[PDB]
């Protein structure tokens, strides 16, 4: 969940040319190859 | 309540009996409770949405089930109301309790609460 500076309506990623155009007034930050990272480490019980 | 005074049959634990040294409370006004709450420190409707959250110093005061602001220091509020009640400025029956699992202090002036005296 990354929010919009300007309306604040949550993250939407359009897969055209790597932007973040929200359903409202366009504020598409065309993030370059900066690699997105979201590793939500899970749980690993054993034995 | 009495632990051993109950019927058996249909009402094995559903019809209880009051103990000796109890006292059910009556209602009262909520004037001086709020008036000491807003002096002792609380603030609501101007605080950013984020404040009342996982941050430890956000115990939110609740009176009778309605939020009345948030206090950074729960101890000063619970202790000051308790000294005030003992002094007699607030009604003897009102009770300030704190749940630390969810940071909500609970000022109850409900009326109908089962009460009891201690030294």
């Amino acid at each position: 969940l990354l929010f919009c500076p300007g309306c604040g309506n949550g993250l939407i990623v359009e897969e055209g040319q790597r932007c973040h155009r929200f359903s409202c007034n366009t504020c598409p930050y065309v993030h370059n190859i900066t690699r997105k990272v979201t590793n939500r480490k899970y749980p690993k019980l054993k034995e | 309540l009495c632990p051993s005074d109950t019927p058996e049959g249909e009402a094995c634990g559903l019809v209880k009996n009051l103990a000796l040294m109890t006292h059910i409370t009556t209602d009262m006004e909520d004037g001086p409770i709020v008036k000491l709450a807003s002096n002792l420190g609380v603030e609501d409707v101007n605080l950013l949405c984020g404040e009342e959250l996982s941050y430890p110093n956000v115990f939110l005061v609740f009176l009778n089930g309605n939020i009345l602001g948030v206090i950074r220091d729960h101890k000063k509020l619970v202790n000051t109301f308790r000294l005030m009640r003992r002094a007699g400025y607030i009604n003897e029956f009102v009770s300030i309790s704190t749940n630390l699992t969810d940071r909500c202090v609970y000022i109850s002036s409900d009326g109908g609460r089962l009460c009891r005296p201690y030294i």
């Binding site: 969940l1 309306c7 359903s23 | 609501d44 009342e52 996982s54 939020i67 969810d102």
Partner: protein, 97 residues
């Protein structure tokens, strides 16, 4: 929440959880499910309430979570609903308090 006056979605998470660790899992639950249908509007989101409630729902949101008081300043009502959601994501009927 959008019917209650807080229209933006940034405000709603800020209400529920700013520290994200499980309150981020409020995110793809509902505010995406809100956004999955293009329905960002405050007046339009009274309208979905205005159908199922068997502009006309500014009043009939007073018969919902009553004792949180409102003088058509719904800010006090929102936090009490947000705290009700706050419990669930953090999650005794017979106890004599």
């Amino acid at each position: 929440f959008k019917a209650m006056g807080v229209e933006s979605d940034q405000e709603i998470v800020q209400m529920i959880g700013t520290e994200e660790h499980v309150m981020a899992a409020f995110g793809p639950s509902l505010e995406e499910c809100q956004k999955a249908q293009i329905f960002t509007q405050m007046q339009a989101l009274k309208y979905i309430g205005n159908k199922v409630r068997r502009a006309r729902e500014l009043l009939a949101s007073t018969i919902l979570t009553h004792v949180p008081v409102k003088e058509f300043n719904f800010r006090a009502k929102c936090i009490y609903t947000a705290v009700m959601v706050r419990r669930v994501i953090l999650a005794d009927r017979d106890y004599y308090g």
